[PDB]
């Protein structure tokens, strides 16, 4: 049943994985035609099951509470809208001409609309019935989102590596919104998995931190808009933000030392941080084996090490605060604010920034454009997910 | 605790993964020096924990029964000995000259000896104490085996793609035993994971089948020794063996239709079959997008489809028999014998055969030598694992 559903998801996802990675990395010709045909079939079958579930459930005597956190649902709709805009540019590019290539955007739009509505209205639904059928359907939808994710990463790693009409605005706009589509796939997959296990079950502040964060929030805005090289202040600000975050988060852990449903929260928090760990690890290798000891190289190495340290210490601080000061209660409510404001800026740059991010120029010549682009496309969405999860967790700590 | 141990394993394995895949696929120079330094550190720390566990346990009031099946332990020792022989060729190649390169074989030999002894004498041990410390140690050892597995696959996919003294016998012999080392890593990882969850818990035949299998067993021997191209009888025999296996396994399912601790057994059986599914999927793509409709192409496509069908139907037959004929009880004991004999030959060819296997010549020009070799090295060990698991399961069915 559950194992069968898992096996099904894995087996069908494995079939998509070889089709996506076999027809794109072969030598004779790029066979992406069957990739779109299978992807269209997956969403159409996934959408058909979803509407069937909606029709037959218009069952769930008890409702979950932590299954649908607002940050998860909000990101799904925000990236779901971006996926719809991406599909508009998808069809807008198709102003020429194969048939399944044109079909793919429309069926994708229908699937994302239906899936977003279904997840919004059934995020915390504890299905007590049709357990056998729904588990396969939920897992099939989970594999569908991961199949789109895998295809999107491969498609991005091919067009970006290899770099008619007004299409330029339609093409580049379409290719700019891919990370948002990948973000939607990651956001849809985690909530589908949350519902899959949720089947057949019944269950005052100081005036120094926020101002420091707000100026960092304001200065962080002034940095990435400036670039919309010969600049080293982007690294300087990021080091200061990460360095301050590392010390501030660590200090909060010291204060606690001086004086349930969380399992998924830690797993998502620690698991999503692996995306930045991997990027930093590749960055560290590229600077100790590649570029010499220069200003840019030293700045990149310090930025990667500070990213690792900040992720680790913020994670341990959030974990400790989740488990749990006459004058330090206001301080504790103040530490969370500085990190929360500093997490939003560290969310904006990777998400809304350009695909060839500034903070990676050595790992470009060290790993090549294609390999480094693939690594970034695989890992950075986990960084965005971690940023949102950390913002939500810091809001929870402030509430507590 | 358990999650922390998992996180630890994942985090340290992720660090090894980027180091192995970053220092080998970069552009300036192949930085495998730090790969051996980290790998040596991992086993040395893993070996130190294992002997520490052995010394302090020379605790476990109750013993598991299905945790250490004989096929799992036997394969570990068989491939553990092969790993020791591989390490002998490893040091035997080092008849020149860096320092850690020479150290790596010796520490690997110590680690494999200690780990094989530890797994043999503690396969079914239900650790009721030191749960926190042992779980991290078991998971760290699990990541150590996977780190060696990942390094072995990358090392194999690099030397094979790029193709002094008598070393030729020392080098080629060393490079021939890599799949056995990878097999040991897969075998060590699964039993380490079996013990990780086993912490803090208290729990007559007919005369037509065997002769058909025995001649197929004998003929199968006569095939692969012949090659130790212009030959198409290897495909002809494999199709006959797989075709007969597909019909025989399916027929056994029909007879049943006419009239607990297994969760890991199905997961290992179905999960390991993914290795052959992936190889077949890549083979199917290479023949419908690449080579035209020729004798070799049609034979390869039929072989891949028959592999998929045989794996699926054998899996469902084994699963159904695990859940569970006045004159058909002898038949049921006879169906298992034909598949069991036919699984041994289908085990011998991928394991003891040459690295450029005969059954893949199109997926060579379609995917390139490097990509196809990497795919085969990733997937085929799962096929060998599945063959052994199927042999053990068919023996169990014959006993039942």
Residue numbers in the entry:
A (entry chain A), B (entry chain B): 28 to 85, 90 to 128, 133 to 198, 231 to 270, 288 to 312, 324 to 354, 364 to 428, 487 to 562
Task: Paste lines from the article.
The otopetrin (OTOP) proteins were recently characterized as extracellular proton-activated proton channels. Several recent OTOP channel structures demonstrated that the channels form a dimer with each subunit adopting a double-barrel architecture. In this study, we performed structural and functional characterization of the Caenorhabditis elegans OTOP8 (CeOTOP8) and mouse OTOP2 (mOTOP2) and illuminated a set of conformational changes related to the proton-conducting process in OTOP. Combining the structural information from both channels, we propose a working model describing the multi-step conformational changes during the proton conducting process.
Mouse OTOP2 was expressed in HEK293F cells and purified in glyco-diosgenin (GDN) detergent. Its single-particle cryo-EM structures were determined using protein samples prepared at various pH conditions (5.0, 7.0, 8.0, and 9.0). The structure from the major group of particles (3.22 Å) is similar to that determined at pH 5.0 (3.06 Å). The structure difference in mOTOP2 between low and high pH conditions is quite subtle and mainly occurs at the N-terminal half of TM6 preceding the highly conserved glutamate (Glu250 in mOTOP2) important for proton transfer. At low pH, TM6 of mOTOP2 forms a bent helix with a kink at Pro246 just one helical turn above Glu250 whose side chain, likely in a protonated state, is pinned to the center of the hydrophobic interface between the N- and C-barrels (left insets). Firstly, the helix-to-loop transition at the N-terminal part of TM6 observed in mOTOP2 determines whether the glutamate is exposed to the extracellular solution for protonation or buried in the inter-barrel interface in a protonated state ready to contribute its proton to an acceptor. The two conformations observed in mOTOP2 structures represent these first two states of the proton-conducting process, whereas the CeOTOP8 structures likely capture the next two states (states 3 and 4).
